[PDB]
Amino acid sequence: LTSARSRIEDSDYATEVSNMSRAQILQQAGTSVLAQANQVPQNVLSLLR
Amino acid sequence: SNLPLDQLLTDLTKNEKGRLTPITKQQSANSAKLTAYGTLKS
């Protein structure tokens, strides 16, 4: 019964690590592109001048 | 920055080495069981 409950409550450390890897790589990208996206209005203002 | 995400990608790698570690725990357990059986045979 312990083994069965463990099958129900124990997961693939590998699968979780994979999901976190993908999420981590995505997050930095999101931050950087947000930073870049702020620039577009700035350049349209430069055009305004 | 980039080298940070790089050494924690090496971190996702070392917990995959920590997946090898389950494998090594089982091999240690199996060696122990083998030795136990052998001494029991003696």
Pair of tokens at residue A46 = 């430069």
Q: Which of A1, A12, A27, A30 is nearest to B5 (CA)?
A: A27
Pair of tokens at residue A31 = 């931050």
Number of separate helices (H) and strands (E) present in chain B = 1, 0
Q: What is the DSSP string of B1-24?
A: -HHHHHHHHHHHHHHHHHHHHHHH
- Give the type of residue at B39: T
Task: Return d(Cα A21, Cα A17) in angstroms, integer.
Answer: 6
Which of B5, B10, B12, B25 to probe by mutation at the A interface, max A CB count within 10 Å? B12
List A residues 1-49 in contact with B (Cβ-Cβ < 8 A): 13-14, 17-18, 20-21, 24-25, 28
**A–B CB contacts, 8 A cutoff, strictly below:** 21
Sign of the torsion angle spanned by Cα atoms B26, B32, B34, B36: negative
**What was the resolution (in A) of this experimentally determined structure?**
3.7
Experimental method: cryo-EM
Q: Which of B26, B9, B25, B5 is nearest to A17 (CA)?
A: B9
Pair of tokens at residue A41 = 């209005």
Contact between residue A26 and residue B3 where contact means Cβ atoms under 8 Å apart: no
